[PDB]
Symmetry: C6
């Protein structure tokens, strides 16, 4: 990554063994469960595009996903290139060239170029722009590998309300609803899919009810 | 987080793999047992709002809880906004804008804004204000998920006094009594819920007795 | 904690995940065995009162003990207040206020106040004064939870002498005899509680004998 | 490795126990699965040729592979020597000599020479040139130890499409196709080797289809 | 411990959790096997007397040993006091007082005093003088707890020579022979205690033989 | 070890718990398998002679080996003394004395002397000279404890060629052939010891063949 040192300046640091192993192990344990995304974002704090490729490339399984991710990355890089074309031919000697999509993606740029962009004044945050593309791709994968529709999350006749709400919001998170819809489906789909006993209790609460109130009610 | 470096100044540091993993593992092991709160507070030492969201978002289970927590956060942010309204429209070029509730919560503010608030003179401690809101929410969850009323913690006929007192103060901690009540329930509910043999001993001690004295007595 | 940095000055550092976990795990494994006290003292090297509360609060079990400890802390704080009363009302603007017992205990003082006391010239070592109170409490707990009287540690007819001496000094340590008595009980209670065969050997050694000599003798 | 310190300059640092153990354990667990290569590249971030030999030499098994790797290294060193011959005899006192192939490979050069090359202005990046040779060799080994031809990766009659695509791109990665071919084999060999039910679905999609679309289709 | 920092001076550092745990675990695993001594010496690199007591005090078992060790420490402290008496009464204000035996042992000296001695010019290396006393005690314990006399280490009729030599030098190490005797017992007791077949081979080698030669011979 | 700090100079650092434990565990797991040597060399990066003795002394088993190693060390020290005799009697006050063999071996030299040699201008690299002697000894041990002659490594009738080559080069490595012979035994002993089916294939390849080619051929 690029870090600030102890005596004030932005420099390249080797990606740590601890980071490398954390990422590989989180993928092995959690696959594309939605919580792996914030974990990825945090393990790649300060990452250069090289570091991002490193983390992605160290994953051994899930090669269908990694291939979908390449595709998403390619589409963002092409849109980057549409937006910010680079003048071709020879660069002014010893000057910074402008990044193309593939440069931001780390496939046509050196570490040194990526460092120069990232620490320039003003900076071109290539590590952050690439990370956004990756996360975009990753979220598509989370969604795709979500094993259950929220329409099938329904409270069992003797399933504790809490356990049902846990299933419901876990599913919703993977299906990747807006926080409008997570804020919203509470007074609607959550009640509808409650079991008959709990449902009567919830209806009787009246609308406006917080989730806490609903969860107390069906305790 | 924001840390002081080795050569004197406040700077942003990447959240560590060790921290990330510690938090995730404490939740996996202890769920909402009350001791997870001080652990959270300590693992988020120096956290920016981003770091706080990071820790929260890396949790995979307990999505009912995380949704209740969002709700509590929203209520605090709205109260923040009631107290400290921000003038709308365009900000003075290159100046610090004032944080809204959603800014403190990290959903409408960048890392750089959060850093600027936190290291400004005078500072706006957004990481600490958000952390307080989170802990407020978390304590509600602890309480909610407390599996037993203190009224049902009663000493078994051959349950050692110590084990009963352990159950009692563990329950009380989750139900989240004041330290008045933890100081207090000792000369009252603790004795009442003791078994007949120990209860006679405790009554006979007379009032004023410390817990130590009571625990020696019913040894 | 408060540490010296690499370039010479006393500053606050976040309590580490390693420290937090070490303490929690030592309690889980060893409960109130007497060796947990020096471990606590060492894990809380440089601790502020906040850090001390942190470590204590992260403990999930043993809530009878933690409540006894609160009581002991309260008694020391009240004695502190007897000794060092603070003038009430409003403090001189921008000056250091004097710590009360509850300030030293971290319940009525901020982190910033604790830092100011601890790094002032001359310093008020609040972290060390609180730690002493805690250890005082902890030693009472060790003693209380000691499962066996030294009067019941007696050498078995075919128990190796070493194993008996191990039991004896382990018990004595928990019962918390002075080092006079640990130096002393060797030529007396240790011999008395030896088995008949070893006892004859020890008597015949004559008095003055070191423990080494006794342990060689009954090999 | 060679790292930048905290106060601005390039210096030699000891290879860490964590790094040493990570590499050895990745080989033990993953052998020559293709993801071990980016792991190697990242664990050897900043490596001198000595460090590279260290990592390679700490591997206990796979000595056929390590011997093939020596051979590949020898061929690159000889090509280096063809390109960049060094004038023989005695070097100018106290000056930097020019690296030969065996110098870059760490067998005829000291640590101090390697440091001097690597930190000279302008630098001779011997650690990076050797690393490239090693990776060249390693990729040959990955390919060689690939247990299955992509021609034999065919979807089972009730094998989920995702699992088949995972097998397919895992195999392709080891066989080490170009990213043209990974981009390409999608609209061709991937469909051909799909099972009859999924194949009809895919054909009917029409060409142009992304992998995501295909994977949704055969869900 | 006392360490040099990164910017040149000797300062107190907290004993690390890693160190604390390493020591406790080495004792748990290896008890008083002779290799625990160099491990202790190395884990206590730079230790103050406080740190030394810390490590010793964190040990939970082996209290017979720890009591023998106290005794040995007391005897060295008394000899220290015989050699280097301290003038009694009041010390020159703000000056360094002279250490007594109990000061070096950490029982009557503060951390600050120990730091002042250790970093004074010229220094009084109290941490090293105490460590020597401890190791003296520890070696007595190793010897005492050695379970087998070297006179009973004899090669089994089908015990490989190597395994016998391993037993022999392991025993000798615990019994704590001089390196004269370890250099020496090779051409004598090692041969004598060899089995008949190997013994003939060794005799026939003639004297002067290295251990390597003997071990090859009886392969 | 001796390390460069962060602010430019060579200073003594405590050997780390991580290093100490890594070395002990590598010996426990791998004994004298040949890969333990480069691991030792790397874990002792920057070591003083004291550190080298530390690592060696922390090993609990293998005392026959450690005794052979002492002997080898003694022979190198005596050859050192033959080469570089030191003038006896009293040293010039406050000057650096010249190292003897036993000084380099750490048995008659203090830490401070070893530091002075190692950081002098010009330096006497005692840590590196001793390390070379140790490795010399260690390689003799590797060879000695090699359980199988390369003459007995022969391909089984249905043993995959790769597995046989793995056995062959593993054995050769322990027997410690030159890299001439490792480069060489490929077109000769490796083919001879192949099984009849593979042998015909290899002969038919013709000479000049790389190992890769041979391994492909007998796939
Ligand atoms: N494993 C993985 C997943 C996604 C992108 C990746 C990788 N490995 C890489 O090097 N990249 C960058 C890259 C992007 C677009 C097309 C080709 C390669
Ligand atoms: N997992 C979690 C729990 C609580 C708050 C959270 C999260 N994740 C976030 O990003 N936030 C902030 C946020 C607060 C309020 C409403 C929407 C989101
Ligand atoms: N777990 C624990 C044990 C002992 C003291 C503690 C704690 N947690 C705290 O915050 N404190 C300080 C405190 C002291 C006195 C009375 C109330 C609280
Ligand atoms: N284990 C391993 C694999 C590949 C190259 C290696 C090693 N160990 C080394 O020292 N080298 C360098 C070297 C290259 C070429 C020929 C001889 C040795
Ligand atoms: N566990 C242990 C073993 C040896 C010495 C120790 C300890 N704990 C201590 O505090 N000391 C110092 C001390 C030396 C002499 C007599 C009394 C105590
Ligand atoms: N365990 C070990 C193996 C080899 C040499 C060692 C040790 N321990 C030491 O202190 N040394 C140095 C030494 C060399 C020569 C003769 C006597 C001792």
């Amino acid at each position: 990554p690029i870090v600030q040192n102890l005596q004030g300046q932005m420099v390249h640091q080797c990606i740590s063994p601890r980071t490398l192993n954390a990422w590989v192990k989180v993928v092995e344990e959690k696959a594309f469960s939605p919580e792996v995304i914030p974990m990825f974002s945090a393990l790649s704090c300060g990452a250069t595009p090289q570091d991002l490729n490193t983390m992605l490339n160290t994953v051994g399984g899930h090669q269908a996903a990694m291939q979908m991710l390449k595709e998403t990355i390619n589409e963002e890089a092409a849109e980057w290139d549409r937006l910010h074309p680079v003048h071709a031919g020879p660069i002014a000697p010893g000057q910074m060239r402008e990044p193309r999509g593939s440069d931001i993606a780390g496939t046509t740029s050196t570490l040194q170029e990526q460092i120069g962009w990232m620490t320039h004044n003003p900076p071109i945050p290539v590590g952050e722009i690439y990370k956004r593309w990756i996360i975009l791709g990753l979220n598509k994968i989370v969604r795709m590998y979500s094993p259950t529709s929220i329409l099938d999350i329904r409270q069992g006749p003797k399933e504790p309300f809490r356990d049902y709400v846990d299933r419901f919001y876990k599913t919703l998170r993977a299906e990747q609803a807006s926080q409008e819809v997570k804020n919203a489906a509470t007074e609607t789909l959550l009640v509808q899919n409650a079991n008959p006993d709990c449902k009567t209790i919830l209806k009787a609460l009246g609308p406006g009810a917080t989730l806490e109130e609903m969860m107390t009610a069906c305790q």
